[PDB]
């Protein structure tokens, strides 16, 4: 269950964070206007050869000025860490 290398984020990662934002807000009881999705890492759990599914995303989202969060999305939000800084490496954590 090794983690991928830190890759720059893409529009699909941005849409992933946009679609899991309601779950994040329901879990934190706080509304977020924009999550910029700075970077992301991937974690393969089972086998899907080319690419379709069976993966965990660890996305560093920028919520605001000096306000970053780390999201763990399976697309169901399985985890999150609040109050992270820009240079914090994305690491795996229990859900």
Author numbering: 4 to 77, 93 to 113
What did the published study say regarding this structure?
We show that inserted peptide regions play a crucial role in scaffold protein oligomerisation via domain swapping, leading to significantly different conformations and surface exposure of these binding epitopes in monomeric, dimeric and tetrameric forms.
SQT-1C crystallised only from the freshly-purified tetrameric fraction and in the presence of 19% dioxane, surprisingly yielding monomeric structure, which was solved to 2.5 Å resolution. Interpretable electron density was observed for polypeptide regions R4-L48 and A93-N113 whilst residues D49-F75 were visible but less well ordered, indicating higher flexibility of this region. The crystal structure reflects the dynamic nature of SQT-1C with higher than average B factors and less than ideal geometries. However, despite these shortcomings, the backbone fold and lattice interactions can be confidently discerned and have been extensively validated. SQT-1C oligomerisation state in solution under crystallisation conditions was further assessed by SEC, which revealed that in the presence of 19% dioxane SQT-1C is monomeric. However, in solution and in the absence of dioxane, monomeric SQT-1C exists in dynamic equilibrium with domain-swapped dimeric and dominant tetrameric species. To assess whether SQT-1C dimer models are consistent with the electron density observed in the crystal, we attempted to superimpose the DS SQT-1C homology model onto the SQT-1C crystal lattice. Melting temperature of SQT-1C was 54 °C ± 1 °C, as measured by changes in intrinsic fluorescence, compared to 79.9 °C reported for SQT alone, which indicated that the inserted peptides significantly destabilized the scaffold.
